[PDB]
């Protein structure tokens, strides 16, 4: 059948400021079918109780979800999003870069 | 300006893992106002927009769950598919209105396994079927005069509710929040640098964001990320161009959004 | 009401 691999963006709700509470977002979009596994990582370990949006899709029928959690960025702490989908041979990790 | 009400329904079979999941989400423009999920652990605490003031309505979602399950069984047969596979039925329906609240057009269409299947034409009277399977659906819906029922919903109920929602939610749904904009500069080598044009905090999601070089569009040389939700109702986007060192002032960023009193023209610094 | 009555494909 037709399958579409997810696009992945990792970013903050508000402009990043070290020591200021924020939200870390992982936006997955453009994928088909809808089954997808998304983890947010802090220093390579899974963050617990991550929330997500209700499954919806774009007018081209491709699905999207937002995964999000409260976080306080620091100079040292590394954040990332880990995504698995039927289209991916292995989980894809996208690092949080505060300038993208 | 103009507004839309749209439902996005997903039904997904999962052989050996119970009956197909049905989820329906309703939007006004880029604001979700209702959700129904047949898998919800608590069907009573399902989310609503704060500007919503019902048993008969929950009842329609419950009936729609059963209807989409009927549809998935029929579709498996129309494509000679085995009982073993998972399949997806998606639907989109609703209405677009102008600034006066007048109907612009209605929508009611379906996709199976990510492929367009059948759509109600703009006339709200006739169907476009993608293949010989969807022609079976078309003949059934023609025999049952389904288009007349969909037309009555799209021209009546849909437009009436969208008008009521826009009035009740006017402080948010009819408020356009302009983008907050800035340009960043990142050397990539001695020879080149990235200029990135940022738009943050805007609603609705529709935005135009471009680079020009000497007033010519850089369509092919611009990296444009998908518009993305911030999680506070607003959206974000950026556009980037790689420029020769020392030529930065030849590039401008052009920002168009409903919340701006005038389109923006941004340079580095 | 919420949502539209759907018809089986």
Residue numbers in the entry:
A (entry chain B): 0 to 99
B (entry chain A): 1 to 53, 60 to 275
C (entry chain C): 1 to 9
How do the authors describe this structure?
Antigen presentation by major histocompatibility class I (MHC I) molecules is central to adaptive immunity. MHC I molecules bind peptides in a groove that is lined with discrete pockets (A to F).
The structures show that FA (cyan) and FV (yellow) 20mers adopt elongated conformations in which the core residues P1 to P8 are bound inside the groove and the extension residues P-1 Ala (one position N-terminal to P1) and P-2 Arg (visible only for FV 20mer) protrude out of the groove. In marked contrast to FV 20mer, however, the main-chain carbonyl group of P1 Phe is rotated toward the α1-helix, a highly unusual configuration, and surprisingly does not engage with any MHC I residues. In the FA 20mer structure, the small side-chain methyl group of P2 Ala allows the P1 main-chain carbonyl group to undergo an unusual rotation toward the α1-helix, which has the effect of orienting the P1 phenyl ring close to Ile52. There is another unusual feature at the N-terminus of the groove in FA 20mer structure. In this structure, the P1 side-chain phenyl ring forms highly unusual hydrophobic interactions with the highly conserved Ile52 of the 310-helix (a conserved element comprising residues 50 to 55). Specifically, the FA 20mer structure lacks 6 residues from Gln54 to Tyr59, and FV 20mer structure lacks as many as 18 residues from Ser42 to Tyr59 - electron densities at an acceptable 1σ threshold were not visible for these residues in our structures. For FA 20mer, the distribution has a high peak centered around 5 Å, indicating that there is a stable interaction between these two residues. CH-π interaction between P1 and Ile52 exists only in FA and FV 20mer complexes, and it is more stable in FA 20mer than FV 20mer.
